Design a binder for these strands. Structure first.
Lengths: 324, 324, 324, 324, 324, 324
RNA sequence: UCUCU
RNA sequence: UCUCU
RNA sequence: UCUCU
């Protein structure tokens, strides 16, 4: 059905302008970018609209903008549908990106020093009610860490966490980001939640894992800039870190296990993106960290993030025993 | 027999269009490959059909295509017979390879997410029937993983699995794959099942193991592309993974226990290839994990694959001595 | 507010010599730098004053100079406002920076050599008064080191130290420095003390931590050069050292536990900077050592600094649980 | 006596052709080869006949051919006696190497999957009668592994093994290959056996160890091609592996201990050469592996070969105690 | 006061020759050297007299000569006061360096094989009387090693050792060399001893540590050449070794811990400089080695020097317990 | 004495052919060397005879040749005296070095293969007589190995061995070699035996130890070439091996415990050089193995040499304390 | 397996 | 120290 | 933690 689209849009070049295409821009290492679609978890498609590095310079465009606009069929020598012109960069906001403050220049409101070491034992119904204090319109903008051993009831919980955030807070947009995960884990999570679920399977390369996470966080950063409240429910901060380890070029130093010291800064940055702004809006990131995985690498990631959050809970060792 | 077959086809220059020799495609780094026969496990010998970078673009040929076609005897400056024209692939015309859906673009239907760990109940029917549960109409297109210590009668089971499949589902395509194994264990398997067996012996280089597995998973995908149900029975992902590790370009320098982080992607991708398609066809991989071999890798490589399948079977640890 | 301030100074082209904007100097690798403001912890943003390699030779400018001067709006080909002339540094003329003694050339008076190890007597006055013993007239210009395990109320103490200094000695310049810390722990500190607080958050790169610390120790030295008494309260030399380690050019290859041997010099130099001058002024550094973080480095880096100060304070090991 | 030979053959260039010289060809990394003599265990001698890379291309010559032929004295600029012409490449077989099948194209007959874990305790007279089932005209073509700890009676056994193979099977040609071994161990073994004994002492370089083994196995490969039955009695597969480790250029990866993953493939190949052929003839390789040697490297080699053979025996721990 | 000197000597170029300057020459990696002053522990000063590599060739000058001589103000393009001419290279000895034997060509008188394992327990008054047998006009020219654990009373002892050498042997010149040491440790040691004390603080770089030690030993070597008796009291041979590790360019091999095998030779050479000469004079080096420091690196240095001396004492474990 | 001997030979230009100065040869990398004297342990000094690449071809000179010949005073452009002509080597003419059998070409007679491990019966006659068993007519040309822990009176024994040899067999050439040892232990040995002692001190570089050992084993071989019986008594193969390891070009990267695999060949070759010749002469090496020094290498290097000799002597482990 | 007044 | 119905 | 008749 992909080759059929190309023939329809090319011979329809008798009217001039009526081909609209959207997505979210990704800017690449060279300078140019692409518009990417959400349905396929932002996968590099042939029906992805190309974006010039020049329009990037024209519309102050940063990777993560929800660009909807006019396109034109590809000219010989090329491969993809270019961005012919621009219509709507976001909501009712004009093509102008020069009238709103950049995420990183917004004024943050801080909680307090106190790290909240919340209890890990109880029914998954209770534990969720503990983390949901980061989802309530009061406690938004916080960094939550869920420390999770194997077989400890994580998946069951995160679903419940996600499910109840959507059903209890339809006021704010939730993005469940899964990483390096079982395909069925994802589709179960997809059907379980009305909102947006973005994930990359274990057979996807680290190249993908990083990009797909880079996408959600910048998209988050952006929706905040429009005074919307966001929640990232990131499954496996440790797993994303592992990808970031293998993507950043070898600086020349490696800490214990095998992890480059330089590699940790990217996921750190992800976690530190969570804030509440005086200007209006919030990003709140509840991440999970895998522990005692039989890999010495994961322990280092943990011990590096150990108490960087606002609250964290170490889950249960009873569901790790009972199997109910 | 090698330097006499050349003499027949060079003397058959009077009668044009007559030489037949079906061989499955390979493609090398440059943008060209050759054709191979299944009886020899796709080995590189003298009498192989040469494929030009010429024909690859027109017929949209890709690694592991079941290519039958006409051949011309080697003109000087060459070393192999040359591909002259193209007959079929398996059913319709060669130009149909332009208008056929790519495997990666096939929409997969997704099953229930449950670990489904099974106990070592005794190497008999009770064990082989629960793997046939992945062969039964209901649960096709899944990733089976068999954990196995040294001397737990895995081959005894693995034969018995292969035999069951072959004598139960004629519509199904069995494709037993063995990597870095003893020469005798292969001969036994080759005669034990009337289906398709491809294997690389232990006295062979890493290059070969990878190549053989590549050639399978590629063929397997093509067979799915024609709405057919396919099952990979692979012996030792550990071996395959271990191979890849020495083949993959030495980069990153991040060695976690013994394996560079960039290696594990290729076996993971090989494994995650398994799926069930809504449009038609099945691909379901049963693979074994070598355990307690006393190698730093085999452990680490297992820890990486542990619980990535939709079922896992542990072949009797400590209970492997109960001789009843 | 960033692209409107440009518009004011470009329209103020009629009235010559009128634009004021005091910023403390930085110098990069080439032989040039910019000017920075203390409220933002000396960050690299758009509205910063550009310093030419031109003015650096005449006024003998060096990294961390408290420079106030006239500025001209950016001519094209640039990106920043340009430094036009020079007003003051803090007291006399800018040409006095030629005939002022260099910090490294100041003759230091030397105190009594005694380890002066103190016990964890309880986090109250009894603890904070013995650090004030390094702030009292008698024992100025010394290297204080606070050993601290996880959760020993160090910040509680560290605030209390900073507060004591600030409400006791108005003649003294407090300069609380935090490296790679949580965003909330910094805000608290910034409001807790009316003095000077500079900090880098954890979600920031190594580059930044080093840079921030550089900017402090440099400023601190200049303040001594004007016969003033200065106190550095630094949180985590461990963090600073850990940072430097990833910043410092990857050479030597000699990794003793996790840290290259060439790294530890920069934090050691930072620490040993503390001194008391016969000519006038004090520089006394209180710094904390993170312990039992379960990182191979944090240990090694402590073993290197252990007993390099003229006093060391261990904040309650195993006794940290006595909640009275 | 070496310089005396040169004067005799040079002034005897008045008749033309009557200087015959033999040996076994070694083909080198460049392309050319040399004919080498068996008396000195195939050592690079000045009285080694040079072989052109062109005759290598003319007579399908592969390293290991027992070439007997006419030679001529060296011409200025050269150093060695060249191969003037060719007479007999092997037995009564003409100069032609184009009429017989290459070793690797011969049809193998396989034993069965079952690895024969044979008992290690008893008099060396018994243990030998256990391994000699690989030397009997029925059980030929097998891979035998003798796993041997230090002081466990290996040398005493191997002699007995060798001695009885020659005295009980004069029908087939036996090659005892020793490696990295005591000089007197070798000369004792030489005088002990009527057949061919090829060895390299511990003071020989790895360069030699590999070559000398490469020679025996290719010579083996070749005699099989002439329908003769061969037995390699290789002392220390682990020791040969150690040399192969240090000869193959650094691929860029090292497994536990220090051994490159790539390095193991060569000795693997040696072991896998053993077969019985439908065409007539056999190669049977009984190798020994050293274990618990105080070197972690040897354990990896072992665990890599662990059960690659057809039968293996772990020797005795009683002669390792008694000293009789 | 440094810039004031330059104006006095430049306008005093109306008389020609009357500016005398001294020091001790350091020859650098390029070829040239500098005259350096003892008051600042041989620090690279702007008022250091430059020495041409040509005069180095004229007066057989080796790094460490106590050169006193005429100088001239710097010419444009330069930076420092050059060596205009030469007056006195040492004592009453003429400018000639061609009339006295080089240190390394002097005839040594040897003690005997017997290493004197002297007792480590007793009052520091006793222990000192044990080491002082290396300071008595009979026992001079010996290599002494003081093996010292932490908190074991080293500093207290070395002071006493030094103090009593100066007060009991004013006949010979003593150089206390401290390395990588607390600033107050040094100034306490300075005021404590009438003789020469040369040290580098812990905040000095390894660049300095090596140079400052290189200086004392060559100066030692030189005073011996003039028939004077010398004693080096080197604090921390292990600490100097650590610097030598990080200064010598990476040879490509590292022993256990992190120390390059090549790195140890320099401190070895230092220790081996101690001798008594038939020609008259002595160098005796009493060094200390740090042990059980929590760094695996220091143990290797120790075990490398273990019993290279003539006598050594392992200090006390009772002052390591009592604190008196 | 160095710059006056030059003056005598330059003034002896009137009388041609008169200057004598016997020195044993060395050869460097290029294809040239110098001449050396035995009293100074073959050191590189000013007054050494220069050997041209010219004379090396004609007289077939090789490293360690006992060369006596005429010399001419240094013409300008040089640095050393030049070799003018050649007198003798030891017996006949220099042109006889063309028609003399090379050491490596000498046919060795081989003795009985028995481990011959001896117990530590007490350091007296009973110990030194069993090493004299390798010096007695019957068992010449063997590899003796003395295992020795710290402080087991090895030197006491080693002297006693050397003394026995020297006062028993005047026909035999003793050649005591010490590597990386204390300066006093050497002087003692030099006077203790009237034979030949060559040694390198500990305060010397690896280069030197190797060089000294090279110079010995070479000389030793030449002495055998003249049908003479030679004995090497070497102190610490461990030291020699350790040296080589840092000298040998850093390649392979395969470090097994601490030593690169390419290193151990040079000491092994040094050791295996020992042999008995049918034609005439003996070469028998007694060498010591340093044990329990607490170095990762010394162990590994011993494990490599363990049981490579035809006898091994362990000097009292745990029984070294029985002081009777 | 960094919880926990 | 991979034995072993 | 290389002491020690």
């Amino acid at each position: 059905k992909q080759d059929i689209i190309f023939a329809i849009l090319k011979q329809h070049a008798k009217s001039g302008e009526d081909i609209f295409g959207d997505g979210v821009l990704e800017i690449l290492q060279d300078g140019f970018g692409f518009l990417r679609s959400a349905d396929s978890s932002y996968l590099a498609g042939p029906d992805d609209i190309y974006v010039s590095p020049s329009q990037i310079r024209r519309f102050n465009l940063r990777t993560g903008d929800t660009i909807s606009g006019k396109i034109r069929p590809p000219k010989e020598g090329e491969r993809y549908f270019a961005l012919l012109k621009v219509n709507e960069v976001n909501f009712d906001k004009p093509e102008n990106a020069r009238n709103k403050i950049l995420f990183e220049n917004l004024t943050p409101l801080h909680a307090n020093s106190r790290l909240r070491m919340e209890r890990g034992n109880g029914s998954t119904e209770d534990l969720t009610a503990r983390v949901l204090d980061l989802a309530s319109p009061i406690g938004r903008g916080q960094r939550g860490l869920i420390v999770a051993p194997p077989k400890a009831g994580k998946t069951m919980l995160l679903q419940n966490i996600a499910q109840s955030i959507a059903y209890n807070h339809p006021d704010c947009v939730l993005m469940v980001l899964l990483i390096d995960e079982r395909p069925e884990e994802v589709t179960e999570m997809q059907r379980l939640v009305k909102g947006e679920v973005v994930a990359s399977t274990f057979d996807e390369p680290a190249s993908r894992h990083v990009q797909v996470a880079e996408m959600v966080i910048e998209k988050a950063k952006r929706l905040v800039e429009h005074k919307k409240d966001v929640i990232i429910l990131l499954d496996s901060i440790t797993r994303l870190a592992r990808a970031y380890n293998t993507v950043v070029p070898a600086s020349g130093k490696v800490l214990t296990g095998g992890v480059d010291a330089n590699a940790l800064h990217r996921p750190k940055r992800f976690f530190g993106a969570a804030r509440n702004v005086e200007e209006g809006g919030s990003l709140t990131i509840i991440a999970t960290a895998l522990i005692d995985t039989g890999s010495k690498m994961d322990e280092v990631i943990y011990e590096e993030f150990k108490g960087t959050g606002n609250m964290e809970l170490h889950l249960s060792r009873k569901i790790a025993e009972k199997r109910v």
